[PDB]
Amino acid sequence: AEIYRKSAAETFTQLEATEKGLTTSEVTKRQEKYGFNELKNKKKDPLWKLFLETFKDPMVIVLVIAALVQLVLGEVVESLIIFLVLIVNSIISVVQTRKAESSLDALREMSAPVAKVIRDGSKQSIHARELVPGDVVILDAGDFVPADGRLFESGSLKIDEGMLTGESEAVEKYIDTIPDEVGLGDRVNMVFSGSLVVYGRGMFVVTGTASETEIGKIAGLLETAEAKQTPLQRKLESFSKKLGLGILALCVLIFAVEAGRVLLGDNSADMATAILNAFMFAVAVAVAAIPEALSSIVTIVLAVGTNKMAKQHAIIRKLPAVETLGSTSVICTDKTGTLTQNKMTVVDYYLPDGTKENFPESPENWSEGERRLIHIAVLCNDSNINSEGKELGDPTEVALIAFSNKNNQDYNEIREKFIREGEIPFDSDRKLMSTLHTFNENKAMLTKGGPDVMFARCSYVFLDGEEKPMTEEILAKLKETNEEFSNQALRVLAYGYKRMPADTTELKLEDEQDIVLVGLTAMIDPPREAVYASIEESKKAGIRTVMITGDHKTTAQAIGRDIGLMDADDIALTGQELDAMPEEELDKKLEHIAVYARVSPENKIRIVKAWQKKGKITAMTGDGVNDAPALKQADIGVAMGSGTDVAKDSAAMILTDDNFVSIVDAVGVGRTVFDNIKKSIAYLFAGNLGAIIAILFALVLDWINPFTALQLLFINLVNDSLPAIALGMEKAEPDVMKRKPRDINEGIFAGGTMRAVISRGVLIGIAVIISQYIGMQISPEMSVAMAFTTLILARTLQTFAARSNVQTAFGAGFFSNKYVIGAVLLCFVLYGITVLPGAREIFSIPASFGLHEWSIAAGLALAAVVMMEIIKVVQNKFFK
Ligand SMILES: [Ca+2]
Ligand SMILES: [Mg+2]
């Protein structure tokens, strides 16, 4: 910016320096007033018990204190079960919040940038945190540029600038003083901090050592510190406490028979302490109706979803948001590095004949000119693939070796067969590089370069025999094949094989005369193969996708056509067009275009804001600083595993393997988490209402109260904590995909839940009431005890089809979930122990043998379940 307009000498006039040396007379002083290089002193678990952290949501811990004031004066009377159920619920929550695995990789991402620099006229390797403005620092293909600056020494230099602004192909570097560019960085020819150099030699004056750097300026947009809530943070419990509190208001009128409420004589003049019993039954009813475990359910169902992503090399942070990827509808992407592999690979070879479209593997089934094209493509390289595959050197030569890997013929054998006989390394001004080798013991000249440069020098072409191209019908074919490749946006390279006569001396600068052309190699950064299926899965899932990248438009059109995103009927859209019209018309054209090219990091904010503004939950995936603002403005951010540490820290999802199908897997676990969180609470809410109507029906006819305070705590202990948690582990529901993303305008009150729990609660109420009326034969220990066991049996047995709203409890239901089987078994045996313990016998004193009517009561409980079963048939029938 601007620095480019002035020369390399005028730029340092403002910034005190001599471009060389910079003794400590200023370095030891002005660096402090200038500030330090690093921005990392910005933005960067206690777990003493961490159960207090869970003790901050609306609780019953204050309510349970009132239990002691009534439980005192009796050694066996005291009931601490309500106190101890909640602490156990927190214990499982905190241990499942730990997940036996922390948000690791926190120690993995270490920058530790080092720069080889000249201080006080001496050669050293000073830490990048100590670079001073105006400093003279050399560059090589073993590190990256540590600070923004202006180049002084220029030759055979290009850098991988695409990490911060998004050109897949590297940009060349040379000294220039063109003032009339924009300043994005695609042509400024200025070193931008953090960018990896390709190869060559670099030596530049360090202009900016501060947050003023372009990478630091990107963090200036990150500096806004945008903190928001989670889309599921809306709390229906706030309405539930209103309903629960209202029941308590009616509950003090439930015990209207008391002398203080009956307004009648014939009873004790004093109100007879039954208020405490009424108050005891009131809070016990209230704590039964209160979905206390619902808050604990949220943590457990989310933690396992994060744990499942940990086995897919998709470790994530910010646990409370994993269903967001399940609820998204539009996905923002980022061409460079995010879809492409950030590794240039040759995908199409063309020869003037070019008979074969796929390069044959075994050389025995090759073509005639294919050998020469490979030989020049393996010998005219400056890279090397070591025993691990380090790909040291320029990426284009790595693609040539990658081509040599396709045929299984390693480049090392040919490089060993003909080591070298002298060569002219590539220089920026003359885009050519020629290497001399031996063919059938005869010295041969091999030169490679740009397409049009060779088309000016393609004085011969050989595929079966060397001959003049007559500058027509073959040179035109080179023009049309170069043109279509440019239409495909491929950095096509042309290769030539010249017959050096007999003994060859050193190759002079002008030896590429009468160079016989071999063929053309077309290379382009290809998208990862994982994104092919990831789109067909997303396309059928009703999740729209848009690609945004600051690369050139021609590349943006080529990709997407290979992915299916491009409409193939309209031109792509560029960032400058957004400014041409108001943002409301941008919303109009937002849905009729899916590719955006040449967009600033701020241009990503406006589009991602518009997607959020239209009510669709958006997600941003990318690598590099050119994506950090969009990640935060998106309520869910996905950082590529190979991106800059700025991107990984800013976003909320990391894919260490750099896989892309994990996003679909993260979508699926997010959808299942929402269904589990929408069904686990549906089960407890439905059964809790069944208890309410049981009390309510006894009110209208003033039946004996059908429940006892000690058992309300017990049913809650066994049908509000364990079964709810187990249902949160519900198997992968049938076709969790193929469903359009859940509408964010609808809460848990959607038809799928309310139109089911309402019927579910009524069926419970009918069952328990029948038990009371059947139990009306004897009021004590028969009318009140018989109803308790039916509710416990009915409540814990209807979980069979509360496991899934699609799969039948028996037709498609099995012991698929060991958690629900264990929870069902544990609550069953625990109740079975406590019905015939021989020590307590809340049931009638005759227990475990006077079961002749316990069968019908148990059968009555199953009758509701089988009547609940036909509701499943109703779900699967046409009557819906
Ligand atoms: Ca409860
Ligand atoms: Mg990128």
Residue numbers in the entry: 1 to 880
The authors write:
We have determined a structure of the so far elusive calcium-occluded and ADP-insensitive [Ca]E2P intermediate for LMCA1 by cryo-EM using a G4 insertion mutant form, which is known to pause at this intermediate. Further visual inspection reveals closed ion pathways, and density consistent with a single calcium ion bound and occluded at a binding site between M4 and M6, equivalent of SERCA site II. The calcium ion appears to coordinate two side chains in M6 (Asn716 and Asn720) and backbone carbonyl groups in M4 (Val287, Ala288, Ile290). The Glu292 residue of the calcium site appears flexible in the [Ca]E2P state (indicated by poor density and an orientation away from the Ca2+ site), and hence the calcium site has lower coordination by protein side chains, which may prime solvation of the Ca2+ ion and its release in the subsequent step. Phosphorylation of the catalytic aspartic acid residue in the P domain (Asp334 in LMCA1) is clearly visible, and the phosphorylation site is rotated away from the nucleotide-binding site of the N domain.
Ca2+-ATPases encompass the P2A and P2B subtypes of the P-type family, consisting of typically ten membrane-spanning helical segments, M1-10, connected to three cytosolic domains: the nucleotide binding (N), the phosphorylation (P) with a catalytic aspartic acid residue conserved in all P-type ATPases, and the actuator (A) domain, which is involved in dephosphorylation and contains an essential TGES-motif containing loop. P-type ATPases perform their active transport with energy from ATP hydrolysis via autoformation and breakdown of a phosphoenzyme and with structural transitions alternating between inward- and outward-oriented states.
